[PDB]
Amino acid sequence: GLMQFTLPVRLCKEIELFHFDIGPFENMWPGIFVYMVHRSCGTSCFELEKLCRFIMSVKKNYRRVPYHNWKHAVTVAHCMYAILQNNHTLFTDLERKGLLIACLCHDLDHRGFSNSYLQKFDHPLAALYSTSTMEQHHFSQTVSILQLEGHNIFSTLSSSEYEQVLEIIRKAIIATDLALYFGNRKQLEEMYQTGSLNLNNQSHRDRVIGLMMTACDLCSVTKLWPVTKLTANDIYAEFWAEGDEMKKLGIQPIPMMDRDKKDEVPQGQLGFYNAVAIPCYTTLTQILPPTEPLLKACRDNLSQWEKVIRGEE
């Protein structure tokens, strides 16, 4: 119990900030995650032996893909840590426990292909899960790893608390399907504006936790410009591979995924910021005022992409 994780001074301070980058040293990422669980949840939330075994099994079931990798998992978990630490009294013990684990597990066994590509390929997972194909697989993989011997980090919870936490994790992981984000934010927008939003209404909490998951999942657009710009290369490396694979199935990919149309990228980032990212962090800031730094950072980056187009960089 008396064993803490401590980070070097620069990390100890910068990790509290939304725009923190976890760095290129992979062997430090597990310690950073445990540090965040201990401060967000407590030193007692998990058996340290079981947590460490869970963390390393989760790492092993992420693939060596350009973007949807172990680094993304830890990055999305850090953004959730930042939201929880800035909204101390709004979330229950089970929710803080659940959401950090959901973020770490949210893209388990990702291959770097969209739900659309699985459907057009006719992948077995598309036959097994007709909607949110990859996300149902990510939750399936999470349950698998929790059921390995020595890996059940929730064993000390009651039967009902256990079922509650697995239901928080399931909903959280399904919400990372961007196809579900558009309707979810629209509903939250109306509820906030007509004043019907009620955080004691479980169906309302679910929607708010969903938007947090979208905000955390997209947080690469809220980093300082040099981090956002370099992460964009990894996300587009996956999109171009998928577009190559669409061409192999005899389907011309949308321009965003066509590597012959790299010129169109800056304008494609504009569309993504205006259609997805700005609306996402605007609604999140209305519902959770202390997440405003994510909206500010997103706006700064929209303006940096505007400069790329105007040939100023």
Ligand SMILES: Cc1cc(C)n(CCNC(=O)Nc2ccnn2-c2ccccc2)n1
């Ligand atoms: C860095 C960093 C991290 C992330 C996630 N991006 C965004 C990369 N673009 C992207 O994901 N596009 C996308 C996927 C599905 N729909 N759309 C889409 C929606 C509206 C307009 C244009 C495109 N950059």
Ligand SMILES: [Mg+2]
């Ligand atoms: Mg995903």
Ligand SMILES: [Zn+2]
């Ligand atoms: Zn993700």
